[PDB]
Design a protein around this ligand. Sequence first.
Ligand SMILES: [Mg+2]
Ligand SMILES: [Mg+2]
Ligand SMILES: [Mg+2]
Length: 33
Amino acid sequence: NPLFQAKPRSFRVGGDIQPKRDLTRFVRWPRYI
RNA sequence: CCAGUUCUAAAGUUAAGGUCAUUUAUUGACUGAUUUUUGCGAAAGACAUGGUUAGGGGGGGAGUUUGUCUGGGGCGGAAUGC
Ligand SMILES: [Mg+2]
Ligand SMILES: [Mg+2]
Ligand SMILES: [Mg+2]
């Protein structure tokens, strides 16, 4: 509407570039933990 | 259930936008990009694998042996024991 108009992004496969998400479970951790 | 990327040797990153505050600045906070989960993912699973024993197999490889007499030695024969 104003010069500020919305610009969508599609994260379904084969689409725009995936964003940063919480990978905590999938992290590589040193032996000890 | 299907699709939100199939004519096209391109472009696709420090983002938009919404909601709420401050502050009037790409400032702050949520959302934009759902949730839960004391297995990154998959394949086998007490099987395989490893350990020690037991029976096979093994000139690939090690070691060694392969009598004596003897008209040279060998082939033959024993005048090798009686
Ligand atoms: Mg054996
Ligand atoms: Mg030999
Ligand atoms: Mg005789």
